[PDB]
Amino acid sequence: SKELLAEYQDLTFLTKQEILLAHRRFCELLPQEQRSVESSLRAQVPFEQILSLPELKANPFKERICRVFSTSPAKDSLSFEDFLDLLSVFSDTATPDIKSHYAFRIFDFDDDGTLNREDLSRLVNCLTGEGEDTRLSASEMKQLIDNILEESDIDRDGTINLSEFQHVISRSPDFASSFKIVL
């Protein structure tokens, strides 16, 4: 995390200065839970330290973004190698397929390759239950999940794979192109 030496697997769209600027962002992000002595390297940066700054509060996808970036167990989360590989997906120069693959992984909670009906409900409820979702506004998406899955499940298993997601979302890849960062 804090050193630039030990086995950095980063096949990525960032040149030598873009990595140095992103390393300075990761350095400002690093020190509150380990405040002065930087002891736990491939473990911090955590969701507590991502939640630390102003506009990471009513963004319903910030814990989803953290989980696709690294994570697996709680508190052992976004190391610097994860830190570069992630924003490389949103870099200018990065391909529409790696951005549509990231959009699939926001809906695919357990990362097994398939959007199940429960994981599509839990993602869409995370963004829709913010500005007063009353009982009819909850029932409209709780009925429309089953009907989106019934129509997009072309292969038969009752669960949306990456081929069936990209048949609805990016067969001509227009939505797949619109995922750019400012670095």
UniProtKB/Swiss-Prot annotation:
- What InterPro entries does the database record attribute to this sequence? CIBP, EF-hand-dom_pair, EF_Hand_1_Ca_BS, EF_hand_dom
Q: Does the keyword Nuclease apply?
A: no
**GO cellular component entries:** apical plasma membrane; axon; cell periphery; centrosome; cytoplasm; endoplasmic reticulum; extracellular exosome; filopodium tip
Domain EF-hand, by residue range, is 95-130, 140-175
Give any single GO term for biological process.
response to ischemia
Q: Does the keyword Heme apply?
A: no
Effect of mutating E164Q: Cytoplasmic localization
User: Impact of mutating F165A?
Assistant: Loss of binding to ITGA2B. Does not inhibit interaction with PAK1
Q: Which SMART domains match?
A: EFh
Compartments, record wording: Membrane; Cell membrane, Sarcolemma; Cell membrane; Apical cell membrane
Q: Which domain of life is it from?
A: Eukaryota
Q: In which tissues is it expressed?
A: Ubiquitously expressed. Expressed in the epidermis, hair follicles and keratinocytes. Detected in platelets and in cell lines of megakaryocytic and erythrocytic lineages. Both isoform 1 and isoform 2 are detected in various cancer cell lines, with isoform 2 being the predominant form (at protein level).
This protein's membrane topology, according to the annotation, is: Lipid-anchor
Mind listing the UniProt keywords for this protein, alphabetically? Answer: Angiogenesis, Apoptosis, Calcium, Cell adhesion, Cell cycle, Cell division, Cell membrane, Cell projection, Cytoplasm, Cytoskeleton, Differentiation, Golgi apparatus, Lipoprotein, Magnesium, Membrane, Metal-binding, Myristate, Nucleus, Phosphoprotein, Repeat, Spermatogenesis
**Annotated residues for binding of Ca(2+) 1:** D108, D110, D112, T114, D119
A single MF term (Gene Ontology): calcium ion binding
What outcome is documented for mutating F107A in this protein? Loss of binding to ITGA2B
Consequence of mutating D119N? Answer: Cytoplasmic localization
Q: Where does Ca(2+) 2 bind?
A: D153, D155, D157, T159, E164
- What do we know about what induces or represses this protein's expression? Up-regulated during breast cancer progression.
**In the UniProt entry, what is the domain comment?**
The EF-hands may also bind magnesium ions in the presence of high Mg(2+) levels and low Ca(2+) levels.
Q: What does this protein do?
A: Calcium-binding protein that plays a role in the regulation of numerous cellular processes, such as cell differentiation, cell division, cell proliferation, cell migration, thrombosis, angiogenesis, cardiac hypertrophy and apoptosis. Involved in bone marrow megakaryocyte differentiation by negatively regulating thrombopoietin-mediated signaling pathway. Participates in the endomitotic cell cycle of megakaryocyte, a form of mitosis in which both karyokinesis and cytokinesis are interrupted.
Linked pathology: Epidermodysplasia verruciformis 3: A form of epidermodysplasia verruciformis, a rare genodermatosis associated with a high risk of skin carcinoma that results from an abnormal susceptibility to infection by specific human papillomaviruses, including the oncogenic HPV5. Infection leads to the early development of disseminated flat wart-like and pityriasis versicolor-like skin lesions. Cutaneous Bowen's carcinomas in situ and invasive squamous cell carcinomas develop in about half of the patients, mainly on sun-exposed skin areas. EV3 inheritance is autosomal recessive.
Subunit field text: Monomer. Interacts with MYO1C. Interacts (via C-terminal region) with PPP3R1 and CACNA1C; the interactions increase upon cardiomyocytes hypertrophy. Interacts with the heterodimeric integrin alpha-IIb/beta3 (ITGA2B-ITGB3). Interacts with ITGA2B (via cytoplasmic domain); the interaction is direct and calcium-dependent. Interacts with the protein kinases PLK2/SNK and PRKDC (via the region immediately upstream of the kinase domain). Interacts with PLK3; the interaction inhibits PLK3 kinase activity. Interacts with PSEN2. Interacts (via C-terminus) with F8. Interacts with NBR1 (via C-terminus).
Any remaining note in the record? The binding of either calcium or magnesium significantly increases the structural stability of the protein in comparison to apo-CIB (calcium- and magnesium-free form).
What protein is this chain from? Calcium and integrin-binding protein 1
Name the gene for this chain. Answer: CIB1
